Design a protein around this ligand. Structure first.
Ligand SMILES: CC(C)(C(=O)N1C[C@@H]2C[C@H]1c1cncc(C#N)c1O2)C(F)F
Ligand SMILES: CC(C)(C(=O)N1C[C@@H]2C[C@H]1c1cncc(C#N)c1O2)C(F)F
Lengths: 273, 266
């Protein structure tokens, strides 16, 4: 339940990944893993706080959240070590030439609901749910990640701290768009989820026809949402309903993940599984 | 957020469990605990235990849908489970395949992990308290009202087998239950799932059987005639260890069992 303090010698770590300075690394005994090197540079401070924030992020253990296996914390380099998800992130899986069946897409959605229900269950606001932060194993089971380090302030600042040698907008609720200092709520995560449902049936990012960013922000704040007609393949009307309900302008008019799970699970089981 | 105060008029019409029809929301199970005289002085305490009951919401625990608090009728209203309890499902003429028994075990682990996550000790996990819907998905129940004292008192005033009980609580009723108390119970549940019956069938008497269990007696593994994976036999032995400390946590179980389930049984 305390963090595993791993050494640099324990790995033969690879080149970067574009789905990240995130890299695949080979542990000498425990085998294949994912490593997020946060810092490289001279010695610095906050060592106890980072190791406590690692302990904090090690607390959250579920079948649908990515597990911290350990951390590297040495003289002038800081890294997070996490379990290997073979098929990469959700958006990578949807774009692949291999067909993703309806039943699988259904299960993926239930597994995300399960995972979000867990984090909210522990009083965690994700703040940055998006297909990047949804990883997929070889059996097409998923786990939720915080690779932005949204919920871990000391690690997130460490990336841009000082002497460091080493996306969101589409899934961010309109209340927080163009807001320098916004407080994200649980219902912020519910909006993100709605855009994720759309992406799962679109097999692409939303807002492809946007030209400038200030155009897209002002559009989404004025009530624009992903084009439902741009869903070419079959998407059940129950899920089309659900994503419209979850990307409501009014935060309070959105449901909660317990509320979603209660409706979606029996629908999934009866119609999609 | 808070509990729903339902009326008896809103319905058609372990405790007097009746299946009842809510006039709008549809079919439910109602546990009418008290029918007769009036006890309105302690209604606040029951409604405070109800709030406590209402806070536990998971896919693998039975949900309180609402409660009836009237002059001389007191009921818990909870979600319907078509196939009844686990022991009833195992004893049916339809053989329940290995893959399903595997999934059942994962769903129990999921549910127990949730309750422990909310600081809940079940204290009386057993096949009777494990209910099964039409697609063989399970939800854990507290029909004995082990964790709800005022309702449990009310249940059995006018108008309990030991096979799944950890040895620390056998002949010690003051011993505080821990998480590891539930983990022993779970071990005996694993056995029953592959046995398709209650253990200790050829015990002489319960006084003597209790003393046997305290001295290290466990269910007969040779009584499992049908196939049981060896790593599940290993798991149930590790979970029914004499020493509470020597048993794994439900988190500990989940992390070993889930990838085993997925790779070998799913
Ligand atoms: C940071 C790390 C290890 C990670 O994914 N997680 C740590 C724990 C579980 C998982 C995670 C996922 N979503 C939200 C939170 C919160 N709060 C969270 O916290 C990885 F992204 F580097
Ligand atoms: C009593 C009631 C409603 C019920 O199953 N539960 C109430 C809530 C969820 C579920 C439950 C199950 N296991 C343990 C606890 C605890 N603590 C529990 O508490 C039913 F048996 F009538």
């Amino acid at each position: 339940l305390n963090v595993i303090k791993m050494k640099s010698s324990d790995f033969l770590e690879s080149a970067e990944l574009d789905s990240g300075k995130v890299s695949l690394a080979f542990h000498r005994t425990q085998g294949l893993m994912i490593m997020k090197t946060v810092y490289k540079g001279p010695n610095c401070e906050h060592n106890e706080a980072l190791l406590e924030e690692a302990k904090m992020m090690n607390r959250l253990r579920h079948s649908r959240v990515v597990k911290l296996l350990g951390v590297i914390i040495e003289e002038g380099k800081y890294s997070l070590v996490m379990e290997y998800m073979e098929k990469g992130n959700l958006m990578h899986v949807l774009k692949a030439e291999m067909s993703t069946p309806l039943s699988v897409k259904g299960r993926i959605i239930l597994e995300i609901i399960e995972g979000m229900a867990y984090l909210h269950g522990k009083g965690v606001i994700h703040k940055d749910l998006k297909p990047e932060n949804i990883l997929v194993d070889n059996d097409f089971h998923i786990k939720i990640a915080d690779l932005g380090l949204a919920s871990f302030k000391m690690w997130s600042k460490l990336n841009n701290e000082e002497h460091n040698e080493l996306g969101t907008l589409y899934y961010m609720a309109p209340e927080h768009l163009n807001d320098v200092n916004a407080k994200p709520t649980e219902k912020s995560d519910v909006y993100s989820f709605a855009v994720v449902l759309w992406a799962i049936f679109a097999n692409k990012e939303p807002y492809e026809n946007a030209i400038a960013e200030q155009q897209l922000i002002m559009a989404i704040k004025s009530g624009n949402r992903p084009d439902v007609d741009d869903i070419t393949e079959y998407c059940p009307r129950e899920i089309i309903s659900l994503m419209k309900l979850c990307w409501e302008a009014n935060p309070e008019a959105r449901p909660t993940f317990p509320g979603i799970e209660e409706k979606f699970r029996p629908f999934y089981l009866s119609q999609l599984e």
